[PDB]
Amino acid sequence: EDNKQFFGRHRWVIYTTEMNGKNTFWDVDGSMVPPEWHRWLHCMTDDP
Amino acid sequence: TQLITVDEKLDITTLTGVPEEHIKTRKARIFVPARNNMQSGVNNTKKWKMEFDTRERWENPLMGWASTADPLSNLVLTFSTKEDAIAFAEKNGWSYDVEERKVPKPKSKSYGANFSWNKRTRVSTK
Amino acid sequence: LLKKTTGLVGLAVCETPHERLKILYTKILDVLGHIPKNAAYRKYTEQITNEKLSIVKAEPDVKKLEEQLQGGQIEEVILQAENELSLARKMIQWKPWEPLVEEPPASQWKWPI
Amino acid sequence: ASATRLIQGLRNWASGRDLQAKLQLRYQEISKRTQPPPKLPVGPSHRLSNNYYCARDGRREAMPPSIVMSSQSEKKAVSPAPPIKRWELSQDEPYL
Amino acid sequence: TRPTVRPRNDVAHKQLSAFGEYVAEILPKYVQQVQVSCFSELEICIHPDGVIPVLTFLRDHSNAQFKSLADLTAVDIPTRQNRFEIVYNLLSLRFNSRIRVKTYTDELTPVESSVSVYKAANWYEREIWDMFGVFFANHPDLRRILTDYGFEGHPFRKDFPLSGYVELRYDDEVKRVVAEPVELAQEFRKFDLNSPWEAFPAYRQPPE
Amino acid sequence: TYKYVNLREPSMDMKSVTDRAAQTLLWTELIRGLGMTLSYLFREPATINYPFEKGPLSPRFRGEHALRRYPSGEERCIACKLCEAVCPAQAITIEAEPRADGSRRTTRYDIDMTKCIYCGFCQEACPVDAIVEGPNFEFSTETHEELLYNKEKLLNNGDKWEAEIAANIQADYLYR
Amino acid sequence: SNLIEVFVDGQSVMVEPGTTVLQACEKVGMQIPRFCYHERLSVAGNCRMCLVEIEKAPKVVAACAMPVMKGWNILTNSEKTKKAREGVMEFLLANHPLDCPICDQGGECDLQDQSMMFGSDRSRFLEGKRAVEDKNIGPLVKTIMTRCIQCTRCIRFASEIAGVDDLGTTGRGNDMQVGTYIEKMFMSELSGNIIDICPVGALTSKPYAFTARPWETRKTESIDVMDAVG
Amino acid sequence: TSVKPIFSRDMNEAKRRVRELYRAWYREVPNTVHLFQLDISVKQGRDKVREMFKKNAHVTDPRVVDLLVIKGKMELEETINVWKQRTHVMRFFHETEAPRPKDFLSKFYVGHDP
Amino acid sequence: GVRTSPTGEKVTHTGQVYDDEDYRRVRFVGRQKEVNENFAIDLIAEQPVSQVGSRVISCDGGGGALGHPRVYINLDKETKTGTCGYCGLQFRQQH
Amino acid sequence: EMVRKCDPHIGLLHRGTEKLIEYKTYLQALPYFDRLDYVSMMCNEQAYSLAVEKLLNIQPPPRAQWIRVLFGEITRLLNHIMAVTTHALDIGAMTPFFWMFEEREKMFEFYERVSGARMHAAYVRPGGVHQDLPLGLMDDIYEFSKNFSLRIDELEEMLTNNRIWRNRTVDIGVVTAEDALNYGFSGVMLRGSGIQWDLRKTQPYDVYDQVEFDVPIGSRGDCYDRYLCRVEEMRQSIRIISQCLNKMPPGEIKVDDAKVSPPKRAEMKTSMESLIHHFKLYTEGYQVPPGATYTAIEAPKGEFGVYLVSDGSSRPYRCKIKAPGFAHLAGLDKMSKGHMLADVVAIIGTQDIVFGEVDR
Ligand code: SF4
Ligand code: SF4
Ligand code: SF4
Ligand code: SF4
Ligand code: FES
Ligand SMILES: [K+]
Ligand SMILES: [Zn+2]
Numbered sequence A: 001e002d003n004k005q006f007f008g009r010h011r012w013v014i015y016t017t018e019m020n021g022k023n024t025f026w027d028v029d030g031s032m033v034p035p036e037w038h039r040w041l042h043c044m045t046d047d048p
Numbered sequence B: 001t002q003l004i005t006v007d008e009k010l011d012i013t014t015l016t017g018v019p020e021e022h023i024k025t026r027k028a029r030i031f032v033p034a035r036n037n038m039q040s041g042v043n044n045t046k047k048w049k050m051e052f053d054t055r056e057r058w059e060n061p062l063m064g065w066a067s068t069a070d071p072l073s074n075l076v077l078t079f080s081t082k083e084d085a086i087a088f089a090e091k092n093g094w095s096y097d098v099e100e101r102k103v104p105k106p107k108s109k110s111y112g113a114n115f116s117w118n119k120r121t122r123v124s125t126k
Numbered sequence C: 001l002l003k004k005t006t007g008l009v010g011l012a013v014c015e016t017p018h019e020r021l022k023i024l025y026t027k028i029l030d031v032l033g034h035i036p037k038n039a040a041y042r043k044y045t046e047q048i049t050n051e052k053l054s055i056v057k058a059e060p061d062v063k064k065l066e067e068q069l070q071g072g073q074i075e076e077v078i079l080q081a082e083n084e085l086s087l088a089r090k091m092i093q094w095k096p097w098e099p100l101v102e103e104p105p106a107s108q109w110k111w112p113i
Numbered sequence D: 001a002s003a004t005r006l007i008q009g010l011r012n013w014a015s016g017r018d019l020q021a022k023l024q025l026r027y028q029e030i031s032k033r034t035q036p037p038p039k040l041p042v043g044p045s046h047r048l049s050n051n052y053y054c055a056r057d058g059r060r061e062a063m064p065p066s067i068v069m070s071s072q073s074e075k076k077a078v079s080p081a082p083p084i085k086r087w088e089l090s091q092d093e094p095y096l
Numbered sequence E: 001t002r003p004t005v006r007p008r009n010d011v012a013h014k015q016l017s018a019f020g021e022y023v024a025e026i027l028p029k030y031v032q033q034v035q036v037s038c039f040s041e042l043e044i045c046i047h048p049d050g051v052i053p054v055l056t057f058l059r060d061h062s063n064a065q066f067k068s069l070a071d072l073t074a075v076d077i078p079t080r081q082n083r084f085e086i087v088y089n090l091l092s093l094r095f096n097s098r099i100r101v102k103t104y105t106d107e108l109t110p111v112e113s114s115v116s117v118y119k120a121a122n123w124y125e126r127e128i129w130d131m132f133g134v135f136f137a138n139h140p141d142l143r144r145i146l147t148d149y150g151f152e153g154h155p156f157r158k159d160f161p162l163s164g165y166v167e168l169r170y171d172d173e174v175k176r177v178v179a180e181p182v183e184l185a186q187e188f189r190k191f192d193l194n195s196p197w198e199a200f201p202a203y204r205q206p207p208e
Numbered sequence F: 001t002y003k004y005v006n007l008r009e010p011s012m013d014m015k016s017v018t019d020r021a022a023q024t025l026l027w028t029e030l031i032r033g034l035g036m037t038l039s040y041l042f043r044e045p046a047t048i049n050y051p052f053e054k055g056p057l058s059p060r061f062r063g064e065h066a067l068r069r070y071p072s073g074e075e076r077c078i079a080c081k082l083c084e085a086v087c088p089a090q091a092i093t094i095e096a097e098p099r100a101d102g103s104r105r106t107t108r109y110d111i112d113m114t115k116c117i118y119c120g121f122c123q124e125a126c127p128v129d130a131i132v133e134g135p136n137f138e139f140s141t142e143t144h145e146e147l148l149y150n151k152e153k154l155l156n157n158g159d160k161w162e163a164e165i166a167a168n169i170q171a172d173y174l175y176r
Numbered sequence G: 001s002n003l004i005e006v007f008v009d010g011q012s013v014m015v016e017p018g019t020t021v022l023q024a025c026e027k028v029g030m031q032i033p034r035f036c037y038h039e040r041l042s043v044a045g046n047c048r049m050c051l052v053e054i055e056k057a058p059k060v061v062a063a064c065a066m067p068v069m070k071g072w073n074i075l076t077n078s079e080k081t082k083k084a085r086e087g088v089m090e091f092l093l094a095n096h097p098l099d100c101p102i103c104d105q106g107g108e109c110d111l112q113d114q115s116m117m118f119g120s121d122r123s124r125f126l127e128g129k130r131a132v133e134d135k136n137i138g139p140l141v142k143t144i145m146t147r148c149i150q151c152t153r154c155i156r157f158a159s160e161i162a163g164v165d166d167l168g169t170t171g172r173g174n175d176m177q178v179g180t181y182i183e184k185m186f187m188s189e190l191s192g193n194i195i196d197i198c199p200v201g202a203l204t205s206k207p208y209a210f211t212a213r214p215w216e217t218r219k220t221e222s223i224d225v226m227d228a229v230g
Numbered sequence H: 001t002s003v004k005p006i007f008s009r010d011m012n013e014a015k016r017r018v019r020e021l022y023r024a025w026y027r028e029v030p031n032t033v034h035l036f037q038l039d040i041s042v043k044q045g046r047d048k049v050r051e052m053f054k055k056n057a058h059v060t061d062p063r064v065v066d067l068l069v070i071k072g073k074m075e076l077e078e079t080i081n082v083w084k085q086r087t088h089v090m091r092f093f094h095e096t097e098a099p100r101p102k103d104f105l106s107k108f109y110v111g112h113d114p
Numbered sequence I: 001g002v003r004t005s006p007t008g009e010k011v012t013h014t015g016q017v018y019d020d021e022d023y024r025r026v027r028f029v030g031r032q033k034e035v036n037e038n039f040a041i042d043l044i045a046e047q048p049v050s051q052v053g054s055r056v057i058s059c060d061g062g063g064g065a066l067g068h069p070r071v072y073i074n075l076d077k078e079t080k081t082g083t084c085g086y087c088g089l090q091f092r093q094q095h
Numbered sequence J: 001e002m003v004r005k006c007d008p009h010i011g012l013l014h015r016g017t018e019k020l021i022e023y024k025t026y027l028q029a030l031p032y033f034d035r036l037d038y039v040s041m042m043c044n045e046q047a048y049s050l051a052v053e054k055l056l057n058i059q060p061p062p063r064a065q066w067i068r069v070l071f072g073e074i075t076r077l078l079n080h081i082m083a084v085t086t087h088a089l090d091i092g093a094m095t096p097f098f099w100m101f102e103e104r105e106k107m108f109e110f111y112e113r114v115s116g117a118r119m120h121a122a123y124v125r126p127g128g129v130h131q132d133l134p135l136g137l138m139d140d141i142y143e144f145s146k147n148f149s150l151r152i153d154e155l156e157e158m159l160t161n162n163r164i165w166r167n168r169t170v171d172i173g174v175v176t177a178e179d180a181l182n183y184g185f186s187g188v189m190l191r192g193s194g195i196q197w198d199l200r201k202t203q204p205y206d207v208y209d210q211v212e213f214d215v216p217i218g219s220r221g222d223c224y225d226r227y228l229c230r231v232e233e234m235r236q237s238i239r240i241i242s243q244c245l246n247k248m249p250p251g252e253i254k255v256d257d258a259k260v261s262p263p264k265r266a267e268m269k270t271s272m273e274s275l276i277h278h279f280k281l282y283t284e285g286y287q288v289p290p291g292a293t294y295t296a297i298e299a300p301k302g303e304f305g306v307y308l309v310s311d312g313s314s315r316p317y318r319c320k321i322k323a324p325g326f327a328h329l330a331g332l333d334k335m336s337k338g339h340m341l342a343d344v345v346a347i348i349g350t351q352d353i354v355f356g357e358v359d360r
Helices: A035-041 B082-091 B111-115 C017-032 C040-057 C063-069 C074-094 D005-015 E011-026 E048-060 E121-132 F014-026 F028-041 F082-086 F121-125 F151-175 G021-027 G079-092 G110-118 G153-160 G193-197 H011-035 H042-055 H062-080 H086-090 H104-110 I023-028 I040-044 J017-022 J026-034 J041-056 J062-091 J095-115 J137-159 J163-167 J177-182 J223-246 J272-283 J324-335 J341-350 J355-359
Strands: B027-031 B048-052 B057-059 B066-068 B077-079 B095-098 D066-070 E031-036 E042-046 E068-076 E084-092 E097-105 E166-171 E176-181 F065-067 F092-098 F104-112 F131-133 G004-008 G011-015 G051-054 G060-062 G073-075 G141-143 G168-170 G177-179 G203-205 I050-052 I056-059 I071-074 I090-093 J291-299 J302-310 J316-322
Touching: A035 F151, B027 B082, B048 B082, B077 B082, B082 B095, C017 C040, C017 C074, C040 C063, C040 C074, C040 E011, C063 C074, C074 E048, D005 F028, D066 E011, E011 E031, E011 E042, E011 E048, E042 E048, E048 E084, E048 E097, E068 E121, E068 J291, E068 J302, E068 J316, E084 J302, E121 J324, E176 H086, F014 F028, F028 J095, F028 J137, F065 F151, F082 F092, F082 F121, F082 J272, F104 F151, F121 F131, F121 J272, F131 F151, G004 G021, G011 G021, G021 G051, G021 G073, G051 G079, G060 G079, G079 G110, G110 J272, G153 G193, G193 G203, H011 H042, H011 H062, J017 J026, J017 J316, J026 J041, J026 J316, J041 J062, J041 J291, J041 J302, J062 J095, J062 J137, J062 J223, J062 J341, J095 J137, J137 J223, J223 J341, J302 J324, J324 J341, J324 J355
Parallel strands: B027 B095, E042 E097, G004 G073, I050 I090
Antiparallel strands: B027 B048, B048 B077, B057 B066, D066 E031, E031 E042, E068 E084, E084 E097, E166 E176, F065 F131, F092 F104, G004 G011, G051 G060, G051 G073, G141 G203, G168 G177, I056 I071, J291 J302, J302 J316
16 A cells, blocks of 8 residues: 555455466456455445 | 328237237236235225236246246226226237226115124124 | 527527517407407407507616516517417417307216216 | 555645545544434324325316317517526635 | 315316317318327327328417427337327417317328428427328428437337437447447346236226 | 637737747648647656556445454344345345244345445445445456355455455545 | 215215225225225225225225215225324234345335325334245245235135135234145146236246346236137 | 228229339339349239239228328339349348248147137 | 165255156266255254244344345244244244 | 438338347346347436336336436436437537546446446446446436536537537428427427427426426427537436435335335345245236327437236336337438438438337
């Protein structure tokens, strides 16, 4: 997170390079975020 | 005279755009719907309804839904009197049958009959 | 006052509204003189046209004439006078004071069915 | 808001307006995404007495339309309403 | 009845009743009924032969000035022998009012077109012909406006089913879009939602 | 009550005439438009870095459908068929029968995600908060048949997204 | 003719002697709400839903049992008739269980329909409801007596039409229950008609249980061929 | 029993209108075949036109056949101008549609439809 | 509590499984048949019965407005427990 | 180079909305009105809700009325942004499309925060609104409206004084006032010819008579005057938005007639009457008394009308939708007579035409 950036860029995720046995170094996905962090990343809440 | 004389029967089957096998092979039914026995209300038995015979419904191979090929499966028409429904069916070229309206005949209701001196209409309890 | 623009597109400003309105109202009266007396259209339109003509004749200024005529600009009042004259001629031609042409059927205007 | 002062000055000169006063990019000035729970009020019919539904039934006061003329003197001519009033020019910004 | 009931307008009701009397007395040759609703709306039901005179009077009279034609509609009521009810909605900017003029026709009788009075009637009754099959005599250019180019039947009639009689699909053998008899993977389920109890006693019809 | 857009007469003195003619000959307002587009070049763009940054959303958001459970393992749906009755697109098909212990449970609960208009009437017609519209929206499929959910798919979606759906419901249930 | 004249909402109607207020109102097309009255059963007059007001009379009468005398004016839509209907509906819904989604009568319930049509829109009950122990009367009729409104159509049907006299009422006050008082199976050849005449979901069809809802079923009128009655 | 006519007072002028519409369709069939690049011959198009006229040939009401002539005129104007595509012109010929059996035995074999 | 078939197909909690001679098993060839491994009938069987000292009890599912509508359960019968019609929880009188 | 005849062929988006409305209840027919004009969602919802409330003889609570007017003005801002920017994009200027579409995304965020859907909210319902405003929404509305003045100023700087822009609009599609009245025009098309007409001023609805604003009036009937009228309508919408923010009253959001509006979820799970009413309202729906009404509002594209015919049941017998794009596309032939092809596309642009409302 970086609260000095404007609303929209103030939270981000760097995906992992291996999720469930799939190489995700270049093949990142939007559906790669678990729900407990999916609620925080989409600005539905203030608490991780 | 701006009013011509036409002595022929009213028939509009050539203008409705219905295919012929949905005209000559369909049986329209004109009837007053029965009161639902689960309820005591009689507001649904005031108007005449004309509907059609039920065609084949089969099961979808994918999800098991009910599939049909009959466009007249959900066609229910409402008429105030019987003769309007008859004229509408005869105008559209549908072979129809008519069922007479069934009304409940009046009864003789007496609260004092529950405590008769010598009749079988006494109530065993209350 | 010589208004530069009436405010409505395509509506030219009238230079002499009084003479135009008087001519139009008298023309409406002469056209309406052909309708039978018992017709209610003739009585109502004669009444309103006579009121408008008296108001126009009793006021030399235009701004207070526009204010008391209650019709916006004087040019749309002239337009309405022309439309009333056209309607009066058409109503002479149609003759709608005659009795009703045909009765409707029994349940023509019954709602709900 | 991360722009330098020189870029801000060039931006304001070329735009002609003070862009820093009204920035289109939102920052921490907006309301938080987590709010305390509310307590919404109740309506006027949430009463324990004098709350009979027959005294406030809107749908049951609807009447069938009144038939004025049906086919089964010197009265004045009647307009559908009083004539509309002339609009007044705006005192705030008449553009005149 | 203050908070949750719609307040009633009575001055507008009186004015609309007086104007309905005025119109029905000026034009007795065509006017058959005049009514004013609960929410202050004036409906004038007229004979179909007087569509042009009534509309021209309402457009051109100094006490009417109904210069705007808002909407033109047909309604399909199959139990009537004149099943189509043609509805004109007019707006008067001079008096800030609205009026409704209603007439009737069946499938085979044409109606006189009102393009010569209001110019919106062109597309409006072209759509009415397209959806209900009501012919309008003396029309400039009457064809279909919303349906498909080869469409047979008028869809807004109440004997026309919801899904039609044909459906489109692309066939590779003829390399073309073709029309076939309609078959649904899931039939449209009909719901009987009418309550068996009377809701509004004020609209109760008398028994036979 | 009204104002007169474009009713400004042009002045006919030599100052205004020379100003208009200089504006014609030297192209002043074209330079104004160029300069302001240049000023708009030197601003930070509003572009977010998808998929690493996501647009803001609300706890009321209507995405993918899910079937919830009570906090004991028992599912919440009791086969009352209100959701399929209120569905404006008829996207829900429900078939029910009493199961082994006599409970009133569904045997078939299908939602057609190609018929559904994502209106949220089903989650507000449910008396037990069984059917919900979860916060997930990235569920594009490569096949039409993958968008025809049965009961097992919806139950799996509920088990997948419970940890977020319960929090959204906890955040929003006081507004209902 | 022996007919007398009465008035329903000011409209004159000729009725036979012995006619009730309910039948006189039915003669002009007005259906007074009922919960216990059945046209093929004896008159019990205990649900008190049919309380209508006779004008120039300071008391509402039970329309299902009151005979009309001449000159009577019946006010079916007056203020105090509606007040009586609202009060009786409130008392009926005071102890009813909140089981509408899990009950087979939903969508075809008389209680739901004429609570929406004639009753109020909210509840003033701030106490706890009662619970009634369920009974077993056979594999045909599912019994949930928490939903029963004590309308006593059960006993009137089983005594006057089926002629069994197995159903009854045991208890007093709010603890009064409808049942057989023993583990007895009400097994007759006309048992499902007690499912038919129950206005609430207290008696339901066990084979039909939890299968459909009444609004989505298509109805086809046919003739039974199981015997020669037709 | 008096009704308002549409265009024809009696059957003779209605038959004249039918004749004129058939002449116009018969004239336009070669141009319709050529302009739309249809796979049919001119003879098949004229046989389809005659088949439609013969199918619609059991009517004796002047107003009904006036409406039929009006709708045929709309179709002809719709085809003279290029408003229909090739699919709308070829929709009169049911090439992809399976042949529906007509006798009792085949209908008995294939389903419950009478 | 999932169960398998002689075909090798998983059986859902509703009891559905394709027949051995059924042709509709071809849709799972090269793919998988999705079932829910958490059977609610087996899960609600593990909940202990709650013992209370009243003649009747009230159930709202827990959470108040976040549960089912509040129902009342009678506990007069001693041979059986009182199951809630919504949530499936059962109750027993202490006496 | 000169156009002699224009024949607009439509019907490529005729979905057949009215028949489907006739086959459903009122609550089910509300999203059909959501999807009619897909840039003016809450205005169409408000027109449908006003017609159904007129037929039901009920009125919404004041807070619902203020919410309705505030979101109608936000909807007007969205519609005017889309119309002006797409008009400029068709003529050839592409920068203000992105510049105002950022603010359009912000207004979509407001819609999603209040309803859960960005475009088709299904928020305004007969009886009020479905859900109350969440806490902290109006502060964001206030900040957005505070910066929107500078956004309008920058769009006007790019477009208004340009000679290339005004050369495409100064004498294009001139309409006289009487021809505008006869052809059924409404809204900005009437106002550009000098006709002083506005449905929010002449036949007002919920609390539009409690707010103060001006009405832009053109003088020449061209496309330039209509564009100026739309820009000034943006400014007046901002003014009404500020007034609605400063005058929001407390109270409930639905009508308290629980036989029309569904009860709260907390009282539905506790009270028997509320549970019965919830069941019947979400299965059968409320019954509307028999009658026909015509209710018209001032949508951003003009006079948007619903002609609703109810037979007494819970489903409408007839629902005619009167859209202004129908009449404007009808008048397009008169507009584009004696002009060029590019003038034809500019005339199409200056009529706010969404074909969802045209074909229906
Ligand atoms: S969101 Fe609306 S359309 Fe979709 S399943 Fe639910 S009720 Fe049906
Ligand atoms: S509304 Fe809820 S409980 Fe009722 S059938 Fe639908 S999901 Fe199940
Ligand atoms: S009997 Fe009627 S009121 Fe009682 S739970 Fe069943 S549907 Fe609801
Ligand atoms: S179970 Fe039903 S029929 Fe029997 S007494 Fe109770 S409410 Fe009446
Ligand atoms: S119906 Fe008369 S008291 Fe029950
Ligand atoms: K029952
Ligand atoms: Zn429980």
